[PDB]
Design a protein around this ligand. Structure first.
Ligand SMILES: *[C@@H]1O[C@H](CO)[C@@H](O[C@@H]2O[C@H](CO)[C@@H](O)[C@H](O)[C@H]2NC(C)=O)[C@H](O)[C@H]1NC(C)=O
Ligand SMILES: *[C@@H]1O[C@H](CO)[C@@H](O[C@@H]2O[C@H](CO)[C@@H](O)[C@H](O)[C@H]2NC(C)=O)[C@H](O)[C@H]1NC(C)=O
Ligand SMILES: *[C@@H]1O[C@H](CO)[C@@H](O[C@@H]2O[C@H](CO)[C@@H](O)[C@H](O)[C@H]2NC(C)=O)[C@H](O)[C@H]1NC(C)=O
Ligand SMILES: *[C@@H]1O[C@H](CO)[C@@H](O[C@@H]2O[C@H](CO)[C@@H](O)[C@H](O)[C@H]2NC(C)=O)[C@H](O)[C@H]1NC(C)=O
Ligand SMILES: *[C@@H]1O[C@H](CO)[C@@H](O[C@@H]2O[C@H](CO)[C@@H](O)[C@H](O)[C@H]2NC(C)=O)[C@H](O)[C@H]1NC(C)=O
Ligand SMILES: *[C@@H]1O[C@H](CO)[C@@H](O)[C@H](O)[C@H]1NC(C)=O
Ligand SMILES: *[C@@H]1O[C@H](CO)[C@@H](O)[C@H](O)[C@H]1NC(C)=O
Ligand SMILES: *[C@@H]1O[C@H](CO)[C@@H](O)[C@H](O)[C@H]1NC(C)=O
Lengths: 73, 228, 311
């Protein structure tokens, strides 16, 4: 059970064909994470989580309601 | 006003538990301290190393040895222990210049984001910025950026002008929209439709050159005033 | 154009200083934490080198993606919108940017890969167009394009009737203007002078850092074993005292550079992420911050260890 990355031979984690957000960055896009029999897995990460916007030359989207957040820095 | 008070207040509360149960929120400040201590330790331990010299302690090289020994030995200590400083010093200067770069950033946020209202997008944190509350922390400052994030969308059909009499009209502030019958000028960042009268619009030229214009009756505030 | 990251290197101190010896590596235990406090130095770089590119490019929650039906009112983006016909989808202008650019020493790969980057700058650039700027302050809001430009004029004080009435003629002033770049990118190898020189300066140091292995430092030879092999432990001490000193002193000279230079990139990286935040995602009011003239919008394009804004 050994994986071959771009970064190097990664022993001890099972490749996964899903793609989730990054957890422990390894290299060349391969991010390991612990998710479950809970075994360290290594999987190509999703840059973001994909979206697509419906653009049409006459159509606009106006927020009807808002929030107020508070974000430490 | 009242709703907003709560959305404020609640948002205040969560911050506490975003802290009280999580120390890693302070990671930055937490590191700056560590890296400091992490230096001194690494610096201190350098006292123990022999740098090739035949003992760690100076006295025991002093005592045991004849000066023409001690001299040549004590150099290795010095030259080593010396060089250990220049490492430790340089690390500071380089590091202490980084802080200086992050101080000059706070002194900016303090000035712009607190004392003013910042127009710089995502300088004050994601979303339109409202105000900021500094809070002191050990060797560092913590800002509470109160930001305005819009929420619930509705699609609309929008057209950039209106031919009324064949002149155009463009909205003075914020877009035209329609929900499918009644065209509405509105302000952009919040949905507050309004019937379109001349105070909302300003004429420019005539139709054709506009691209996407749409018919409508642009209401006339005056005219009913003439019912007499 | 701006640098963003520099090549993440790593140098095992122990091996460089002392290549392949049980002798040599027994002296280096005495000099103490040096080796072990270098590798911590050169990591602090390699960490942030991936923190930079994290901060510049990924400011966006989600990867947006373009609509397959391109109508912007005449503005022709196919130049900058990505290419399915490459293996990695990089819009035309993104590729010119690639071509025009020219002992224990490792080089690590960048966390985000030059393909992934091209997804971000194909998101920003793709959410800039449909969503206006509102995707920076929230979740994107589809808004027609030419009903955006009307809101990037009021930013510069020109009132929007100067768009819809000029709309066409602008599109050409635009659609053309995009064209010139290509030549000016293809004609001029000094367009990239910034990025080009960063990458040099690094590989300029190693080639200097490597030649050090060839130096006497007053010692008899630069082959660390020929001392060891020919000459005896009570002798080879001193002779190897020097090399270990020099070759070490030659690290610090190199390590110090990086920390100094990396802090420079670190400074140019923030300038990006400020543009990329303010310039791209907003409409920047800071005179000549986003380029000469009243600023309308800006289109990021990735480049190797760099970023290229079209203002
Ligand atoms: C606008 O949004 C806010 C929150 O995003 C809404 O406030 C909440 O409304 C629900 C019921 O609609 C209540 O149960 C919650 O307690 C409210 N929140 C708070 C903090 O009190 C508000 O109703 C929305 N208004 C509209 C017109 O959609
Ligand atoms: C678009 O919005 C307008 C504004 O509300 C609607 O016109 C009025 O809608 C209210 C809804 O409570 C009715 O009571 C009024 O009678 C409507 N005005 C007229 C003159 O009929 C309109 O219905 C909305 N259209 C759509 C398709 O949503
Ligand atoms: C808006 O309504 C006007 C009516 O004033 C339309 O203009 C007419 O277009 C037709 C189409 O050929 C012509 O036959 C008429 O002569 C035009 N009117 C006049 C007074 O000459 C226009 O097409 C409509 N456009 C929109 C976008 O609603
Ligand atoms: C947008 O511009 C692109 C180039 O910037 C145009 O692409 C050319 O299209 C013609 C067809 O009319 C082809 O013969 C050329 O080979 C294309 N050029 C390249 C480099 O591939 C495109 O036509 C324009 N389209 C729009 C809608 O503006
Ligand atoms: C405004 O300026 C632009 C360029 O500065 C002018 O655009 C050109 O105008 C000439 C007219 O002599 C046309 O032949 C060209 O086709 C225009 N350029 C393009 C790309 O279409 C424009 O004419 C100027 N307007 C005025 C009223 O002087
Ligand atoms: C990924 O998918 C391919 C084909 O869909 C399959 O052959 C391969 O075993 C999968 N890899 C993992 C780690 O599941
Ligand atoms: C707007 O219209 C699109 C049509 O593609 C739809 O997917 C989207 O959910 C709509 N948004 C709202 C808020 O109704
Ligand atoms: C918008 O695009 C549609 C394509 O469905 C086209 O029919 C229409 O004329 C366009 N109108 C504007 C204002 O762009």
């Amino acid at each position: 059970n050994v994986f071959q990355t771009r970064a190097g031979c990664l022993i001890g984690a099972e490749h996964v064909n899903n793609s989730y957000e990054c957890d422990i960055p390894i290299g060349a896009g391969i991010c390991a994470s612990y998710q479950t029999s809970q075994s360290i897995i290594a999987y190509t990460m999703s840059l973001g989580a994909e979206n697509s916007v419906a653009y049409s030359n006459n159509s606009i989207a106006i927020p009807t309601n808002f929030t107020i957040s508070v974000t430490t820095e | 006003q009242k709703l907003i008070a709560n959305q404020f207040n609640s948002a205040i509360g969560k911050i506490q538990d975003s802290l009280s149960s999580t120390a890693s929120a302070l990671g930055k400040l937490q590191d700056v301290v560590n890296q400091n201590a992490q230096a001194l330790n690494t610096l201190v331990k350098q006292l123990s190393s022999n740098f090739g010299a035949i003992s760690s302690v100076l006295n025991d090289i002093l005592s045991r040895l004849d000066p023409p020994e001690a001299e040549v030995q004590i150099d290795r200590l010095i030259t080593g222990r010396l060089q250990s400083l220049q490492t430790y010093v340089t690390q500071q200067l380089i590091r202490a210049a980084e802080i200086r770069a992050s101080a000059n950033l706070a002194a900016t946020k303090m000035s712009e984001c607190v004392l003013g209202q910042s127009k710089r997008v995502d300088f004050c944190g994601k979303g339109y910025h409202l105000m900021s509350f500094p809070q002191s922390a050990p060797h560092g400052v913590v800002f509470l950026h109160v930001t305005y994030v819009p929420a619930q969308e509705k699609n609309f059909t929008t057209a950039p002008a209106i031919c009324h009499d064949g002149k155009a009209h463009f909205p003075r502030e914020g877009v035209f929209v329609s929900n499918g019958t009644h065209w509405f000028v509105t302000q952009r960042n919040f949905y507050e439709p309004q019937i379109i009268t001349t105070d909302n619009t300003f004429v420019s030229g005539n139709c054709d050159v506009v691209i996407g214009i749409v018919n409508n009756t642009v209401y006339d505030p005056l005219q009913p005033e003439l019912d007499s | 154009i701006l640098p963003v990251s520099m090549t993440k290197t790593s140098v095992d101190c122990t091996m460089y200083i002392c290549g392949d010896s049980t002798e040599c590596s027994n002296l280096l235990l005495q000099y103490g934490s040096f080796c072990t406090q270098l590798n911590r130095a050169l990591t602090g770089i390699a960490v942030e080198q991936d923190k930079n590119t994290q901060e510049v490019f990924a400011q966006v929650k989600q990867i947006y993606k373009t609509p397959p039906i391109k109508d912007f009112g005449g503005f022709n983006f196919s130049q900058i919108l990505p290419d399915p016909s490459k293996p990695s989808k990089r819009s035309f202008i993104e590729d010119l940017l690639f071509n025009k650019v020219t002992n224990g020493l490792t080089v690590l790969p960048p966390l985000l890969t030059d393909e992934m980057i091209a997804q971000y700058t194909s998101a920003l650039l793709a959410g800039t167009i449909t969503s206006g700027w509102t995707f920076g302050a929230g979740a994107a809001l589809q808004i027609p394009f030419a009903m955006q430009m009307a809101y990037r004029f009021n930013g510069i004080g020109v009132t929007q009737n100067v768009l819809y009435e000029n709309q066409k003629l602008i599109a050409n002033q635009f659609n053309s203007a995009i064209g010139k770049i290509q030549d000016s990118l293809s004609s001029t190898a000094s367009a990239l002078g910034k990025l080009q020189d960063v990458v040099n300066q690094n590989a300029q140091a190693l080639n200097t850092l490597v030649k050090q292995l060839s130096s006497n430092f007053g010692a008899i030879s630069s082959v660390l074993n020929d001392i060891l092999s020919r000459l005896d432990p009570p002798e080879a001490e001193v002779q190897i005292d020097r090399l270990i000193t020099g070759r070490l002193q030659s690290l610090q000279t190199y390590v110090t550079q990086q920390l100094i230079r990396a802090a420079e990139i670190r400074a140019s990286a923030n300038l990006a992420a400020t543009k990329m935040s303010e310039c791209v995602l907003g409409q920047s009011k800071r005179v000549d911050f986003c380029g000469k003239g009243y600023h309308l919008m800006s289109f990021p394009q990735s480049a190797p260890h760099g970023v290229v804004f079209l203002h």
